[PDB]
Symmetry: C3
């Protein structure tokens, strides 16, 4: 029962790891589409958001 | 031990918050790339997906 | 108390589901922006990342 809660958290951690690989690959695609404009953040006029695990 | 499970859930919540900042900044980049076409959802011919915390 | 930890994990699972809908719609937008170049992965020269729930 406490083991079942721990297994759900491990599954959920593997899911977030998978999803973050999709997100960061999307970010690299946007960095390439915005190469001539100074990059994604410079074009939005925003501070860049980075992912911390 | 129950405290260790609670700490893992708090770490995991801080991670998802960080990742969602990257995702929403990517969405704003796509909204700008698709400005002339009526926006990302109008160009996909989809209902827009929004993030609910 | 164990029920409160389980409720937090269910809320967190609903959040990740919501966020993944935003991420995959962003991926479909990038697939369309990169249609002429062979697709997002072919343009990055990367193996494609996919999301596994
Ligand atoms: Cl994304």
């Amino acid at each position: 029962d406490l083991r079942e809660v721990e297994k759900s958290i491990s599954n959920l951690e593997k899911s977030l790891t998978s999803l973050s690989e999709v997100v960061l690959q999307n970010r690299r695609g946007l960095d390439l589409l915005f190469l001539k404009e100074g990059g994604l953040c410079a074009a939005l006029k925003e501070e860049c958001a980075f992912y911390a695990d």
